[PDB]
Paper text:
Lipin/Pah phosphatidic acid phosphatases (PAPs) are Mg2+-dependent enzymes that catalyze the dephosphorylation of phosphatidic acid (PA) to produce diacylglycerol. pmcLipin/Pah phosphatidic acid phosphatases (PAPs) are magnesium-dependent enzymes that are evolutionarily conserved from yeast to humans. They catalyze the penultimate step of triacylglycerol synthesis, through the conversion of phosphatidic acid (PA) to diacylglycerol (DAG). Structurally, all lipin/Pah PAPs contain highly conserved N-Lip and C-Lip regions that combine to form two domains: an immunoglobulin-like (Ig-like) domain and a HAD-like catalytic domain. The remainder of the C-Lip adopts a Rossmann-fold, forming the haloacid dehalogenase-like (HAD-like) domain and harbors a conserved catalytic motif DxDxT, where the first Asp coordinates a Mg2+ ion that increases its nucleophilicity, and the second Asp participates in acid/base catalysis.
Residue numbers in the entry: 10 to 50, 57 to 87, 92 to 121, 125 to 154, 167 to 321
Amino acid sequence: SYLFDSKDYSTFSGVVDIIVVRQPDDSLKSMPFHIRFGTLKINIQITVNDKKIEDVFMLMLPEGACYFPELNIQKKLRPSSAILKKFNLKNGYNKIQFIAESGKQLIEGKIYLYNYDTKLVISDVDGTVTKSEWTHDDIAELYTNIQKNGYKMVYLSSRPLYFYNYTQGYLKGIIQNGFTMPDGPILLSPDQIISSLNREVVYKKADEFKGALLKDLRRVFPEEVNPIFAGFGNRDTDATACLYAGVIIDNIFIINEQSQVEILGKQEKSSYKKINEKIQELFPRLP
Ligand SMILES: [Ca+2]
């Protein structure tokens, strides 16, 4: 908190976790790339899973945001399937690295590959994982068991970019009665990642930022699948975004100040503990 205030050498260097999805025709589609090279005034090379990607590169804009030069030359945050196929991604987590050649600066990141039939479970972070940092009791066990049954937890954050790396540590350092938070991408509300390449629509919203994020996530999947199975949040604005994103009302969970989880569709007040007891009824194992 007081580090940025005075150190001042903490502009964001890093990458926001990337999501890629294999379509049924074997093509690849990804969410927008958001990578920043801190205090750099250029080409960028990529290395995935400790393997350099030959003849693929990004450029940087004066403001610091990077993009893919792709001809129809348009500056693209979403690379083409041909670029993404050169990554040779594996299912689940992949290590990705970007090297800006000015000297040479390196940022490491995460890039996830899902199949079009993957079922995701969304979880807000502030107020949903954290308790207004204290964590709600028993969430790690629940989320762990949800992940065991075949779903992929996706975390949602609206914190400024300079807290992104911090946020990754907090989630990954949580321990409850031996359980930990399943690894998954932390998506960022588009209002926290503004740049010339994405001003167009983000600039013109208010509380639809979460909904815009959920639909940017929906659109890397084919329109004929409902990839978002369930949602965890703590404000009614979370439920509204889940509802407009196609999540059935029975799979929307909203926690309040005293850790009471309302299952909207059932008009049932519950808890992470009780929801975990019914994990197989509420989150049935996937084949
Ligand atoms: Ca919240």
